[PDB]
């Protein structure tokens, strides 16, 4: 029932005009209010729609291909630890997965596989954690042959998702078919474009007016706010 709709109550004071842009504010939706210390408040709410995409999405920047160029040139790679295998992922060079077999004392066996090698108006959108978000797909293959596919080189696609606290790490590992896997990578630079930014619903603000004879906002959250400040 639309859990992800945000709200926030503010106290603009006594005299205030309902904004027109964005959401619309009516008058019959008003609510009588009284506090424990006999303060009379008159509060109003908007219609919770937050529909359409009239955010004036103007982007004069180029395509996101140049954004990931420094990652390719840097050649600094991260790793990911799984239950058995170790998926080592690099952008621009290859994607390799291996499992270490530590023999007793002298040698260490290696079981290394090769995922692949690298020698439109509606942007595609994938569902991650139940949420719809755009992503930029890439295509590469020419990996180690698989007997299940009759000596067919593997192919995989790298997924790009933004996160402000990401360090080019791997979120999860999944496969679409035998010898056909998919790698999810969190890059913090791709979302700078408004189209590629994280799909966050804009906040819808509720103002609750304070009529004269009472202060602009109620009296207990004062001492609550100094208390939270000195703790």
């Amino acid at each position: 029932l639309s859990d992800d709709i945000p709200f926030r109550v503010n106290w603009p004071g006594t005299e205030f005009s309902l904004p027109t842009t964005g959401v619309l504010y009516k008058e019959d939706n008003y609510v009588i209010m009284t506090t424990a210390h006999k303060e009379k408040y008159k509060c109003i709410l908007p219609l919770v729609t937050s529909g359409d995409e009239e955010e004036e999405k103007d982007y004069k920047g180029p395509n996101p291909r140049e954004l990931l160029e420094p990652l390719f040139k840097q050649s600094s790679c991260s790793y990911r630890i799984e239950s058995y295998w170790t998926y080592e992922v690099c952008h621009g060079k290859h994607i390799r997965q291996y499992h270490e077999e530590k023999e007793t004392g002298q040698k260490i066996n290696i079981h290394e596989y090769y995922l692949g090698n690298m020698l439109s108006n509606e942007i595609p959108t994938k569902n991650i954690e139940g949420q719809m978000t755009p992503y930029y797909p890439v295509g590469m293959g020419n990996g180690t042959p698989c007997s299940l596919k009759q000596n067919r080189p593997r192919s995989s696609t790298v997924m790009y998702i933004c996160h402000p606290e990401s360090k080019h790490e791997i979120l999860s590992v999944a496969e679409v078919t035998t010898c056909e896997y998919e790698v999810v990578i969190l890059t913090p630079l791709l979302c700078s474009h408004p189209k590629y930014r994280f799909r966050a619903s804009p906040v819808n603000d509720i103002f609750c007016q304070s009529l004269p004879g009472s202060p602009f906002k109620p009296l207990t959250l004062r001492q609550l706010e100094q208390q939270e400040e000195i703790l």
Partner: protein
């Protein structure tokens, strides 16, 4: 004329406190209603908080809301809270979260700790507001301080969490709670071997002397009381260490859930039996309403319990076309708190199309989140069948084969279904091999 109402309310309170009998409770409730007939506030709210829930008075939702109107016009600190509760989950009234937000915030304005708990929970897990750290943490501390105020004096009554469907985030610290755990389990194993009387040989048990095992489990329950009391004291203390700045560095995301655990145990969590008892002898119309308050407060147990009894369409207030969306809502809330079975229930919700449209991709992602995080063979087998028949994504065999194998060694009881499934899969493969 108010003195007579005060006397009647005092008599009802004395009857309720001195006697827990059902007939005495009913007489006290009738006296409280008689006192509230002249609009005396305290007994009015006392009968209000049980009339809506039931198991004390007939459940009259519409009269409860009409009463709550004037209760809130008076300025009752506890009247705002339940009215916002009712308006939140669409209980006998159209649902909208903004008026519920203002009502809840003005209840917490008046000092109601239920309302501070509510604000802290809905700010923590971003429902009705934007997700944040500071506000939820502050509102949670404002209730947990009083929680320990009750724990340190009264002893902190221990309640048994029952489910009707039944950084440093690994353990939120170590040490003291671990040794509480070993102390409790050593006490349990001591009491259990104390009950043993198989080597009596005309003695020991004193020929059905029940007067020794009764005190044994009574002492076990009192030690349980003490041990979980110390557990809660320790957990609040580590929450305050992790909270402000000290011991370990500033860490909101490993402090708020410890605070929430401390508040969750508390004293409000006695309505769990008041609702489970109501459910156990019919009375399915009171279970969802007593559970909804605790599921607005944020209880994972209450969230899953209310959702389970809604899923089997026995709730009578909600329309039968609305029970499925609400149950989906509350199961998703239980999923947000990490309750495993809610994830598989949500996946089946997206799978057979209860409430929401049939969409296999969503079902697959809930099944996968249930699989690799909680290591649950149920949803994982379900997604193995997804690969087996080929819904949503491409069709093959070897994938589903290896997840069936991992289901085989994942849980000891999963020996037989995967075997049947593998037999069916092998039969299909052999027929295709024959067809090739």
């Amino acid at each position: 004329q108010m003195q007579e109402a005060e006397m009647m309310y005092q008599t009802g309170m004395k009857i309720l406190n001195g006697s827990n009998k059902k007939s005495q409770k009913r007489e006290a409730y009738r006296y409280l209603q008689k006192a509230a007939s002249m609009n005396h506030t305290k007994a009015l709210e006392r009968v209000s908080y049980a009339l809506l829930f039931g198991d004390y008075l007939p459940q009259n939702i519409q009269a409860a809301r009409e009463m709550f109107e004037k209760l809130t016009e008076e300025g009752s600190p506890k009247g705002q809270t339940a009215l916002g509760f009712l308006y939140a989950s669409g209980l006998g009234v159209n649902s909208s979260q903004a008026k519920a937000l203002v009502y809840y915030t003005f209840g917490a304005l008046g000092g109601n700790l239920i309302a501070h708990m509510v604000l802290g929970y809905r700010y923590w897990a971003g429902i009705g507001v934007l997700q944040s750290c500071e506000s939820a943490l502050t509102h949670y501390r404002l209730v947990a301080n009083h929680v320990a105020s009750d724990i340190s004096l009264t002893g902190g009554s221990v309640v048994q969490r029952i489910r009707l469907p039944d950084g440093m985030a690994y353990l939120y610290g170590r040490g003291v709670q671990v040794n509480y755990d070993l102390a409790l389990k050593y006490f349990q194993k001591a009491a259990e071997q104390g009950w043993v009387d198989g080597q009596l040989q005309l003695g020991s048990m004193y020929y059905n002397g029940i007067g020794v095992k009764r005190d044994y489990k009574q002492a076990l329950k009192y030690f349980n009381l003490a041990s979980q009391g110390g557990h809660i004291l320790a957990f609040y203390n580590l929450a305050q260490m992790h909270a402000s700045g000290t011991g370990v560095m500033r860490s909101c995301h490993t402090a708020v859930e410890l605070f929430k655990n401390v508040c969750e145990r508390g004293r409000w969590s006695e309505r769990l039996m008041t609702a489970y008892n109501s459910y156990k002898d019919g009375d399915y119309n009171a279970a969802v309403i007593q559970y909804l308050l605790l599921a607005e407060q944020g209880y994972e147990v209450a969230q899953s319990n209310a959702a389970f009894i809604l899923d089997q369409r026995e709730a009578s207030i909600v329309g039968e076309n609305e029970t499925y969306p609400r149950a989906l809502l509350h199961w998703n809330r239980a999923a947000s708190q990490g309750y495993t079975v809610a994830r598989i229930k949500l996946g089946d919700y997206h799978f057979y199309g209860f409430g929401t449209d049939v969409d296999y991709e969503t079902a697959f992602i809930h099944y996968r989140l249930a699989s690799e995080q909680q290591h649950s063979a149920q949803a994982m087998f379900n997604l193995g069948y997804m690969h087996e028949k080929g819904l949503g994504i491409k069709q093959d065999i070897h994938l589903a084969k290896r997840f069936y194998d991992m289901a085989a060694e994942a849980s000891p009881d999963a020996q037989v279904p995967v075997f049947l499934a593998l037999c069916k899969l092998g039969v299909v493969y052999f027929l295709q091999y024959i067809r090739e």
